[PDB]
């Protein structure tokens, strides 16, 4: 059944994490906002399909806020990957199918490139390679303004505003405090560190996705890179948060995709 | 410097309405499915000012080119349109050109690239239809008024700039009003499946493929994958389905720069 709790890793991070199911491991790395409650619904669906699912709030975000300052500053896919590996080590997860969007996606690719032995298959979604216009000066305004703007930006890219809104007051309160922290340590360093070089994409199977309703330009390069490297590339319903907008379709994708690499 | 406007009847019986501007290497602007060439007015001057003779026209059966046999606007495919264009190009004495086209215009560009490579200096396809959206699944079965109502809103939504779209004028929109039904009856059902996107259709001449920057990814997702896998230059243009209307300056710059690439 679903377990919820905390675990303090040797890097000082007091992780808030959840787990459900039995069977092969599936890890759901949240996006830049680091809020794992977004995976609640799909998590049950995936878990009921013969997989042990693990999710967690990201370092310094939401319930994983009790972490060293260093763990949420100058963030890169590889930096996050290191933290993830330490967490996986402590939870005794030897190998897993890994899902990730935005910064989570960058982490997935970092895992595939630097820790291929821990990845069964990677499922990156909308890897940031160039920050959009709206995030250029996000850190230059008051924290309250950052939360206001990012709350609007996120809701707009939710893929389903009713579902987004339906995440609940608790989640949205947590997100409120996350916005400024995310702005200060993610957007400027995440994109340039994207592990999308040829050397990063062939160690383990990868199934790449982008939002079906996401404006083409946003993650256009993701599609071209995948196609050029001969990596499976397709779309998922919604935009940036397919696990919130279309939990059923998201769960199905994670299950089928992961299931095909099992042996 | 001055816009040339006229009519010409080709051997196939089509009374074409066309426009031309500038002198030098030829640039042809094939309209989209709506076949309304007034959408290229602004960029037409911009491009022509850079040393190109630009030519555009209302598509057969559409707008001012409405006096055409019914077969020229029924069961339309990229190849059918290409045949007509070639005849027109012959009539206007255009030997080779840099050709632009969106939607059905894009299918036409690819057809030209595949079947009449000798007439194309470089192809610039934009949003080639390969898989119709659900909004068009049953558009050919409803009455003209409903088609016009729906397509007018549909088109405006895909304009990429509602203000510039609206600013096309009452004349244009009145012409568009009548084109909608005709388009629906002869394009959406047959254009997509006829898309000249086979491997052997894309490598006889240089091609520079584009998709709207604001267009929902899924709409022309296949265009991007095909291009990338086939090693064809692929990118985006600001706007959606009508970059020539929404962003005339950027559109003009793209056409000029890409065409320049293939000139000696
Ligand atoms: C915060 C989250 C979604 C915000 C909505 C935004 O509207 C999403 C726009 C796409 C980019 C998101 C992004 C860029 C970046 O450089 C680093 C990141 O961690 C993200 C990211 O995780 O996006
Ligand atoms: C009519 C024009 C744009 C209409 C707005 C619509 O919102 C455009 C939707 C995307 C595809 C348009 C299209 C599909 C097709 O199978 C054949 C076509 O000739 C077109 C086309 O030319 O699109």
Q: Hey, what's the torsion of the CAs at A215, B183, B4, B21, to 10 degrees? A: 30
Return the closest-CA partner of residue B226 out of B197, B200, B256, B262. Answer: B197
Ligand nearest to the CA of A218: 1
CB contact at 8 A, B14 and B91: no
Q: H-helix or E-strand containing A177?
A: helix A169-185
Nearest CA to ligand 1 atom 15: A187
CB contact at 8 A, A87 and A11: no
Interacting residues of A25 by C-beta distance below 8 A, sequence separation 6+: A51, A52, A53, A54, A93, A94, A95, A96, A97, A120
Tell me the nearest-neighbour CA distance from A244 into chain B, angstroms: 19
Q: Is the CB of A200 under 6 A from ligand 1?
A: no
Cα(A210) to centroid(ligand 2), Å: 23
Ligand nearest to the CA of B158: 2
Return the closest-CA partner of residue B88 out of B186, B20, B178. Answer: B20
Q: H-helix or E-strand containing B254?
A: helix B248-260
Neighbours of B68 (CB within 10 A): 21
Q: Across the beta sheet with A25-29, what order do the strands follow?
A: A3-8, A14-20, A52-56, A25-29, A96-101, A119-125, A207-211, A232-236
Separation CA B124–CA B244 (nearest Å): 13
CB contact at 8 A, A122 and A206: yes
Separation CA B115–CA B112 (nearest Å): 5
Ligand nearest to the CA of B176: 2
Separation CA B99–CA B259 (nearest Å): 9
Q: What is the DSSP letter of B262?
A: T
Nearest CA to ligand 2 atom 3: B155
Q: Is the CB of B158 under 6 A from ligand 2?
A: yes
Our CA angle for A124, A253, A221, nearest 5°, is: 30
**Among positive and negative, which fits the CA dihedral B231, B130, B78, B199?**
positive
Cα(A106) to centroid(ligand 1), Å: 11
Q: By the CB < 8 Å criterion, does B220 face chain A?
A: yes
CB A214 to CB B216 under 8 A? yes
Q: For residue B106, how far is the Cα from the chain centroid?
A: 6
Separation CA A59–CA B202 (nearest Å): 48
Q: Which residues of A touch B236 (CB under 8 A)?
A: 216-217, 220
Separation CA B232–CA B141 (nearest Å): 37
Cα(B33) to centroid(ligand 2), Å: 6
Tell me the nearest-neighbour CA distance from B192 into chain A, angstroms: 19
The coordinates were experimentally obtained by X-ray
Question: A216-228 and B221-230 are packed helices; what angle lies between their axes, rounded to 10 degrees?
Answer: 40
What separation in angstroms does the CA of B189 have from each of A216, A234, B176? 25, 25, 19
Tell me the nearest-neighbour CA distance from B133 into chain A, angstroms: 12
Q: By the CB < 8 Å criterion, does A152 face chain B?
A: no
Supply B258's token pair: 């890409």
Our CA angle for A91, A110, A61, nearest 5°, is: 60
As to burial, measured by CB atoms within 10 angstroms (0-12 exposed, 13-18 middle, 19+ buried), residue A22 is exposed
Neighbours of B174 (CB within 10 A): 10
CB contact at 8 A, B230 and B206: no
Separation CA B115–CA A145 (nearest Å): 57
The count of residues in chain A is: 263
CB A223 to CB B218 under 8 A? no
Strand partners, A56: A17
Q: What is the DSSP string of A75-112?
A: --HHHHHHHHHHHHHHTT--SEEEEEETHHHHHHHHHH
Neighbours of A149 (CB within 10 A): 16
Separation CA B57–CA B64 (nearest Å): 9
Half-sphere exposure of B101 (CA within 13 A, CB side): 33
Q: Is the CB of A153 under 6 A from ligand 1?
A: yes
Q: By the CB < 8 Å criterion, does B158 face chain A?
A: no
Max CA distance (Å), chain B: 51
Supply A36's token pair: 């794992």
Q: By the CB < 8 Å criterion, does B134 face chain A?
A: no
Q: By the CB < 8 Å criterion, does A156 face chain B?
A: no
Half-sphere exposure of A132 (CA within 13 A, CB side): 17
What separation in angstroms does the CA of B207 have from each of A6, A225, B55, B85, B106? 55, 19, 19, 18, 11
Separation CA A251–CA B67 (nearest Å): 55
Interacting residues of A235 by C-beta distance below 8 A, sequence separation 6+: A209, A210, A211, A212, B217, B218, B221
Q: Which atom of ligand 2 is nearest to the CA of B132?
A: 16
Q: Which residues of B touch A217 (CB under 8 A)?
A: 213-214, 236
Separation CA A66–CA B77 (nearest Å): 62
Half-sphere exposure of A156 (CA within 13 A, CB side): 8
**Among positive and negative, which fits the CA dihedral B111, B114, B118, B121?**
positive
Q: What is the DSSP letter of A137?
A: S
CB A215 to CB B218 under 8 A? no
Separation CA B28–CA B120 (nearest Å): 10
Supply A85's token pair: 């590996």
As to burial, measured by CB atoms within 10 angstroms (0-12 exposed, 13-18 middle, 19+ buried), residue A136 is exposed
CB contact at 8 A, A100 and A107: yes
* Dihedral pair phi/psi, residue B252, rounded to 5°: -60, -40
With left for phi above 0 and alpha for psi between -120 and 50, is residue A54 left, alpha or beta? beta
Strand partners, A207: A232
CB contact at 8 A, B218 and A239: no
Separation CA B26–CA A96 (nearest Å): 57
Q: H-helix or E-strand containing A114?
A: helix A103-114
Q: What is the CA radius of gyration of chain A?
A: 17
Q: Across the beta sheet with B120-126, what order do the strands follow?
A: B4-9, B15-21, B53-57, B26-30, B97-102, B120-126, B208-212, B233-237
CB A224 to CB B215 under 8 A? no
Return the closest-CA partner of residue A79 out of A53, A54, A55, A103. Answer: A103
Q: Is the CB of B188 under 6 A from ligand 2?
A: yes
Candidate from A213, A217, A218 with C-beta closest to B218: A213
Candidate from A210, A218, A227 with C-beta closest to B229: A227
Beta pairing, strands B53-57 & B15-21:
antiparallel
Which residue of A lies nearest to B220 if distances are taken between CA atoms?
A216
CB A219 to CB B220 under 8 A? no
Strand partners, A140: none
Size of interface A-B (CB pairs under 8 A): 56
Return the closest-CA partner of residue A76 out of A121, A7, A127, A41. Answer: A127
CB B211 to CB A212 under 8 A? no
Half-sphere exposure of B77 (CA within 13 A, CB side): 11
Q: By the CB < 8 Å criterion, does B233 face chain A?
A: no
CB B213 to CB A213 under 8 A? no
Helix (H, G, I), strand (E, B) or coil at A259: helix
Return the closest-CA partner of residue B161 out of B44, B43, B45, B240. Answer: B240
**Quick one: resolution in A?**
2.0
CA end-to-end span of chain A, whole Å? 25
Supply B92's token pair: 């206007």
Q: Which atom of ligand 1 is nearest to the CA of A131?
A: 16
Return the closest-CA partner of residue A39 out of A247, A262, A248. Answer: A247
Overall number of domains in chain B: 1
Q: Which atom of ligand 2 is nearest to the CA of B158?
A: 7
Q: Token match 């939607």: residue?
A: B103
Separation CA A106–CA A104 (nearest Å): 5
Strand partners, A14: A8
Question: B104-115 and B78-91 are packed helices; what angle lies between their axes, rounded to 10 degrees?
Answer: 70
Q: For residue B2, how far is the Cα from the chain centroid?
A: 23
Interacting residues of A125 by C-beta distance below 8 A, sequence separation 6+: A99, A100, A101, A102, A104, A105, A208, A209, A210, A211, A236, A242
CB B224 to CB A223 under 8 A? yes
Beta pairing, strands A52-56 & A14-20:
antiparallel
Separation CA B60–CA A212 (nearest Å): 34
Q: Give residues after which chain A gaps, C-N over 2.5 angstroms.
A: none
Supply B108's token pair: 């036409």
**Domain housing A22:** 1-263
Separation CA A93–CA A80 (nearest Å): 17
The count of residues in chain B is: 264
């Amino acid at each position: 059944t679903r377990t919820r709790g905390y675990v303090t890793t040797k890097d000082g991070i007091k992780w808030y994490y959840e787990q459900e199911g039995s069977g092969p491991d599936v890890v759901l790395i949240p996006d830049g906002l680091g809020e794992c409650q977004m995976f609640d619904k799909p998590m049950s669906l995936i878990a009921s399909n013969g997989f042990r699912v693990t999710t967690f709030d990201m370092p310094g975000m939401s319930r994983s806020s009790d972490a060293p300052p260093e763990t949420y500053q100058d963030i890169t896919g590889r930096k996050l990957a290191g933290y993830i590996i330490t967490l996986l080590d402590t939870l005794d997860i030897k190998i897993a199918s890994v899902w990730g969007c935005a910064s989570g996606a960058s982490t997935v690719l970092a895992l595939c490139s630097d820790y291929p032995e821990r990845v069964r298959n990677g499922m990156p979604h909308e890897v940031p390679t160039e920050n959009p216009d709206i995030l250029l000066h996000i850190h230059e305004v008051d924290p309250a303004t950052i939360s206001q703007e990012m709350a609007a930006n996120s809701r707009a890219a939710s893929g389903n505003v009713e579902a987004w809104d339906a995440l609940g007051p608790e989640v949205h309160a947590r997100l409120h405090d996350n916005y400024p922290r995310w702005a200060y340590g993610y957007p400027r360093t995440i994109p340039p560190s994207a592990p999308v070089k040829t050397e990063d994409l062939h160690k383990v199977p990868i199934d790449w996705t982008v939002g079906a309703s996401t404006p083409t330009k946003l993650f256009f390069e993701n599609i071209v890179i995948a196609a050029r490297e001969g990596i499976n590339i397709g779309t998922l319903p919604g935009n940036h948060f397919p696990y919130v907008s279309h939990p059923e379709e998201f769960a199905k994708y994670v299950v089928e995709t992961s299931r095909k690499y099992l042996k």
